[PDB]
């Protein structure tokens, strides 16, 4: 009763495996370490097999010659580290919810690193309870360069353990539990939905496609893997894009006042305009 499986199980070189790195780091940013090879091949060969090569030296031609094609995309998804939480440094919402409540007018936010949607969609819970869900009061702008994560996050689809850093009010109000096979599950309401926009934007282009001026934009988590040129490149386009009195807030281990004085700390890695 034993029929031994094997599918096909293909070779990346130690010469692949570098041109893979200048790849993602000339298109992305990334920079990824030795230590990753090994998830590295294991969604990438995923790649070779749908395109039917056994040849990572033919994949990256095919990548290499056309840059354009949607399989860059496909390469992209394969190579970002997406991991985040609702409600990740937490310390930053109460700065944000004090500096809507006083700006006036609309207060627009700008998440440039949204993955799966926890970060977007904390910030639309923190508005909508410090301004109350109102048409015009305040909207959420939030990209990500994967798309893979965006589909997701358009769901808005968590598991309820996901949430337990949400208040038994917050829940109520802004989420639908489910039942039967699909329980344990919950999705974001329409309501609270309808106030963030979701799109694709790879930080390294040199012009965003973004509705700004922004009151606050939050760049949290991302700067880790990409080095200090591409990061200083990045903070110069943040500059044109907050309004006068606006706010940047950075993740946990990123310091950006040291990489461009125009930008000055205020509290917990958030900074303003000097
Ligand atoms: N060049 C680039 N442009 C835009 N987003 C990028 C990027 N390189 C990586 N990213 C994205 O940055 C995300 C970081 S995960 C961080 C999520 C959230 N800000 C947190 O603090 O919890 C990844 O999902 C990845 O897709």
Same mark, same amino acid.
């Given at each position: 009763?034993?029929?031994?499986?094997?599918?096909?199980?293909?070779?990346?070189?130690?010469?692949?495996?570098?041109?893979?790195?200048? %790849?993602?780091?000339? +298109?992305? &940013? =990334?920079?990824?370490?030795?230590?990753?090879?090994?998830?590295?091949?294991?969604? /990438?060969? !995923?790649?070779?097999?749908?395109?039917?090569?056994?040849?990572?030296?033919?994949?990256?031609?095919?990548?290499?010659?056309?840059?354009?094609?949607?399989?860059?995309?496909?390469?992209?998804?394969?190579?970002?580290?997406?991991?985040?939480?609702?409600?990740?440094?937490?310390?930053?919402?109460?700065?944000?919810?004090?500096?809507?409540?006083?700006?006036?007018?609309?207060?627009?936010?700008?998440?440039?690193?949204?993955?799966?949607?926890?970060?977007?969609?904390?910030?639309?819970?923190?508005?909508?309870?410090?301004?109350?869900?109102?048409?015009?009061?305040?909207?959420?702008?939030?990209?990500?360069?994967?798309?893979?994560? %965006?589909?997701?996050? +358009?769901? &808005? =689809?968590?598991?309820?353990?996901?949430?337990?850093?949400?208040?038994?009010?917050? /829940?109520? !109000?802004?989420?639908?539990?489910?039942?039967?096979?699909?329980?344990?599950?919950?999705?974001?309401?329409?309501?609270?939905?309808?106030?963030?926009?979701?799109?694709?934007?790879?930080?390294?282009?040199?012009?965003?496609?973004?509705?700004?001026?922004?009151?606050?934009?939050?760049?949290?988590?991302?700067?880790?893997?990409?080095?200090?040129?591409?990061?200083?490149?990045?903070?110069?386009?943040?500059?044109?894009?907050?309004?006068?009195?606006?706010?940047?807030?950075?993740?946990?281990?990123?310091?950006?006042?040291?990489?461009?004085?125009?930008?000055?700390?205020?509290?917990?890695?958030?900074?303003?305009?000097?």
């Amino acid at each position: 009763s034993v029929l031994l499986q094997m599918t096909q199980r293909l070779a990346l070189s130690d010469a692949h495996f570098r041109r893979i790195c200048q %790849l993602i780091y000339q +298109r992305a &940013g =990334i920079v990824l370490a030795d230590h990753k090879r090994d998830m590295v091949y294991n969604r /990438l060969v !995923r790649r070779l097999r749908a395109l039917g090569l056994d040849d990572f030296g033919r994949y990256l031609s095919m990548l290499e010659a056309n840059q354009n094609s949607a399989e860059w995309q496909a390469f992209i998804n394969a190579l970002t580290t997406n991991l985040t939480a609702f409600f990740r440094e937490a310390h930053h919402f109460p700065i944000l919810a004090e500096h809507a409540r006083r700006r006036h007018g609309e207060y627009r936010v700008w998440s440039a690193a949204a993955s799966t949607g926890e970060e977007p969609y904390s910030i639309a819970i923190t508005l909508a309870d410090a301004l109350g869900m109102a048409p015009g009061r305040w909207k959420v702008f939030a990209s990500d360069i994967d798309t893979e994560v %965006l589909e997701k996050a +358009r769901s &808005g =689809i968590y598991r309820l353990s996901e949430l337990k850093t949400l208040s038994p009010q917050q /829940l109520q !109000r802004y989420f639908m539990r489910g039942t039967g096979p699909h329980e344990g599950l919950v999705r974001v309401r329409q309501e609270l939905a309808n106030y963030v926009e979701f799109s694709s934007v790879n930080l390294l282009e040199k012009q965003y496609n973004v509705p700004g001026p922004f009151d606050a934009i939050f760049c949290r988590n991302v700067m880790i893997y990409f080095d200090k040129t591409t990061q200083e490149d990045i903070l110069r386009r943040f500059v044109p894009l907050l309004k006068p009195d606006g706010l940047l807030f950075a993740g946990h281990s990123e310091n950006f006042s040291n990489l461009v004085r125009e930008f000055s700390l205020r509290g917990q890695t958030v900074y303003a305009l000097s």
